[PDB]
């Protein structure tokens, strides 16, 4: 995928929060869960599930700003960090990300489907560190997941 | 094939929708979608490739509009969408989700073909009293968007 | 040439009208108009005479419905009318004005040809969720009217 | 049959009338009704009724001039348009058309009979458009039909 | 077979018709009908096929003449028709209706056989005082029509 | 919607007009009208703009021809006009009045679009015995006019 991991996300993440604390800005933390992924690998194997992960990554990467931090958390999960962005930018970004996953992923001669579920947290309101914000965002994506809605902010 | 209706069907349904809006005191949005890069697709890869892109483009629009929204192919790089009594919020979101879909280069065969979307919006009654007038305003506004190198003009 | 649309057009517009009514929380009336005496008109006077009567019948319906009402010819002795969000009062009056029009034997050439109207009504959502369902209820109700020797059944 | 329909007849028809108006010529409009046809389909079916229509068409087509417009109106009905022809040409054409339908049509192992009824209208005398002339011709074929005579001009 | 009378019968009836016309001060038309393409039909398809064509040709002439008109087969491709006291209008129409039947290629078996009609006319008293004289004038006139590639000569 | 007939209608009416001219001993002019600048219009402004220009072009031709003159759209930049029994003076004048109409750039929306006319003429019988032959002569002559940078060639 080329996408960074949990450890990188955490280092950049907290620096972004330190910077926001000093500049008096907000930070949005998105927790993206792609349901249908545990079923893809358990049916088509790792290569197919990995090719879907590569498409998913490129799709997120192409839609975020240059200064936005995208990383893969683990399994069905990706994290996005937005430093000092308007709520309008967020609503639009969520819509454009959800729109991409309406398109079943073409891997080989297969047409694989993933459903997106996104939770949002805001710094400072939801927490003072990345671990706290991710748990709020994870709780909110799980609320969205169980409610059968695309996103919860 | 696309399954998508043509100019003639769009016009009949379109005007009925406007007649209904006139009576109910509602607004109607008319979107003019131009997909740049398409004239270069047929001139390089042929009709089948250009047509396979049209089939994907149609399915992509169809999957994102509401059941009561009218989608049709105007001609060439052009598609028209009609929204009866929808909030401006619904339109801004619909435009974003449609634009997002064309950022994805279309896979036709072993090719990865790119189209760029340009959309113009008109509102009934403000912009006109018939479908021909509204489409001309929307077409003028997508051409403003096209020359300005921006995605949409409302 | 009646100018009136066909079954295929009626179905596309029809279902869109139903999709719109579903969303807006409105009713739709579907009228099934059968003109008895028409099977005898062509078997006696020929197609041109029967067609000239169809042209008068069409113009008579068209002149009495609202701009937003959908009128189409189903087939043979049959016409369909779709009323989006109209009061029951509007319907009772429309049925009376349509029936009144066919009390008038149609003048084709030196002939004075008579047709008797039979109308069945269905209401969306009560009578069905699609156009084929509503047309069958309306058709069943016009046939009840036809056999009962009454003009309409709602 | 290969024969054009009502819509084609009307377009060519009116052009012929526009041309006659300018050139100071007459136009004959023939309305041909083939009685016995409603009984043919109600007994032998569409294929048999259609095979009779194919023979009827070829019979009319073979007897008119190259510049004469022949079309099927609908059901037992055919229309013929004669631009600038002598009344002698018309009397002869009517005789030759009536003569063909004295011959019962051979469809399969069947010998099917149709009776011709023709009405004539003349432009300008009978009307200024094709719709008017066809109604006069239709009225005159119906007079012929009820009178048990072959043609009325 | 055809049931049609022969040369010998035609001659007896023929002259009686002329005797009657002489006394009543009436005209008689004598038609000489030659059907070209008949010598080729028997030489290709045989006697039964050529005979079946003769049976159709006979019935076609018989169905188009008046009850008082004398029809007979002369010889090869030849038939004779006698019209007692008929208007010239009746003759022009009869010739047209006979020519019209032979434009229709004869269906014998799975074959579609073509015969071309050539008719010569003679008038009593002008052209002769007996049937032999009138038939020769009519035969000369059908031969003029045959060579001129026209249908009839009167 | 220009309302203008297509190639297949033009051909049927066209040949009938030629059949009629053959019999009456009259001439027929066949005009092949090409509108240069049209391929550039659709490739820059799109189909709606190019179509609105086609609607204006059609109405402009239709308003300048006689009631008995046949106007049709061939395809793309092309239109065909058929003149039955008209004087050469009528033709020279008609060509001048048609060329004069395209000197004024067409107004579609907020755009001022330019088309340049090229007309080729063929005469029946001199140039051919059917519509296909005459159209090829007219097409060759409009192409001679096109390359010569002149408006018309007869």
Numbering used by the authors:
A (entry chain Z), D (entry chain V): 94 to 246
B (entry chain U), C (entry chain Y), E (entry chain W), F (entry chain X): 93 to 246
Article excerpt on this structure:
We report the structure of tDGC from Thermotoga maritima, an important enzyme for the large scale enzymatic synthesis of c-di-GMP and the first GGDEF domain from a hyperthermophile. We expressed and crystallized a domain of the TM1788 protein from Thermotoga maritima (248 residues, WP_010865403) spanning residues 82–248, hereafter named tDGC. Cellular levels of c-di-GMP are tightly regulated by the opposing activities of diguanylate cyclases (DGCs) that synthesize c-di-GMP from two GTP molecules and phosphodiesterases (PDEs) that hydrolyze c-di-GMP into 5′-phosphoguanylyl- (3′-5′) - guanosine (pGpG) and GMP.
Enzyme assays showed that tDGC is active even after days of incubation at 30°C but with very low product production, irrespective of substrate concentration, due to feedback inhibition. However, a mutation (R158A) at the I-site of tDGC significantly alleviates production inhibition, enabling synthesis of several hundred milligrams of c-di-GMP with just 10 mg of the mutant enzyme. We also report the structure of the R158A mutant of tDGC. The R158A mutation in the I-site abolishes feedback inhibition by preventing formation of the inactive c-di-GMP-locked dimer.
